[PDB]
């Protein structure tokens, strides 16, 4: 049995911004998957020994989202509450540049995100050092597609 | 099985994983 904690970034279908409200903690067992009930216990560096834990609920709706089928997954309009907008995964910045003024300090050029593209996975094959309203975020080689197709 | 490939498109990126006894 396995425990996972998840982080997300809002994805923009055009002008408006959307974000998927998947559960914060999802527990897997290889053959079985279920949401972590409460996670009201300390996580030691040695591993996971929850002093107060019990059996977890089952739900085919939300669980199937994590099974790879995003058609019937969580969905939430986040225009009012922007929330997370850029994350660093695999050393490749994941940002929703359609609503954040992301820039590259290698040349000062603005990165253009078009409605046909939802998320831009900026890598070092086009931006060695990136700078979103801050300081040097050194990005390594590519590990992700440059963007995600709308369809 | 969490297909990490499809969750990444909608922005869901795994940030930590472990096991419990």
């Amino acid at each position: 049995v396995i425990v996972h904690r998840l982080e997300g970034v809002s994805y923009n279908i055009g002008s408006q911004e959307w974000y998927t409200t998947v559960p914060k903690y999802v527990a897997t067992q290889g053959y079985l998957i279920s949401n972590f009930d409460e996670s009201s216990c300390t996580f030691m560096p040695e591993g996971t020994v929850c002093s107060q834990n019990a059996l977890y609920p089952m739900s085919p709706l939300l669980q199937e989202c994590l099974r790879g089928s995003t058609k019937s997954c969580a969905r939430t309009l986040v225009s009012g509450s922007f929330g997370n907008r850029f994350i660093l995964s695999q050393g490749n910045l994941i940002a929703n540049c359609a609503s954040i003024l992301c820039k590259c300090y290698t040349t000062g050029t603005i990165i253009n995100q078009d409605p046909d593209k939802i998320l831009t996975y900026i890598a070092a094959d086009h931006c060695p050092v990136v700078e979103v309203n801050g300081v040097t975020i050194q990005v390594g080689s590519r590990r992700y597609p440059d963007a995600v197709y709308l369809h | 099985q969490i297909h990490w490939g499809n969750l990444s498109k909608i922005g869901v990126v795994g940030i930590g994983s472990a096991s419990y006894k």
Partner: antibody
Amino acid sequence: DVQLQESGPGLVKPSQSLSLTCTVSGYSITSDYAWNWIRQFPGNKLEWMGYISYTLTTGYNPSLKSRISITRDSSKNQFFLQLNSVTTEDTATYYCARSGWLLPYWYFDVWGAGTTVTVSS
Amino acid sequence: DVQITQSPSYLAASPGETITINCRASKSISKYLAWYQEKPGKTNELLIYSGSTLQSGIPSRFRGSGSGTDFTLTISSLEPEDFAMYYCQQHNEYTLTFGGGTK
């Protein structure tokens, strides 16, 4: 920076399991990426065996799948290999490499120095 | 059933000229091919990953190319320290297949 220096017993006897330990130093193994074991046979031919992602998902080479397994550790920044039912032609040099967990873009960036595993009398 | 065949198993060289190494497949793998340089007594260093991208810190001499099934590898202005074994690896599907050596 990130370095990988593996070690293990290279004098395994035929028809018993082997053991290989890779000590990832300079970067945590549970943060991200995927960790791999690659071996090259005598003859410079390389083969890919299996991966341990940052999460606890794991797949192996279909040829070796029935007798291979990948583990890890958290307090110690290491991930191991237990391959049982060793036959005559499992002798090779086993390498430690780091790659992304997404397919495609599965290329190996940092490699290990390598160690020699022999299967003989 | 992806099998990668690297044709030039041996190639001579001299300091100051260009040499082309090739690799071939049997099923289309797009532009996804990588090139690793193995100096003796050191760790393998990737040079070109998917497409023809220079890895950060790798000299501009090495130049990837190719698409679909047949790729190449071009080295310009061979310095006396550029002699090692160059392998190619396809990273589009599983059963990740490498290639033969080169000198």
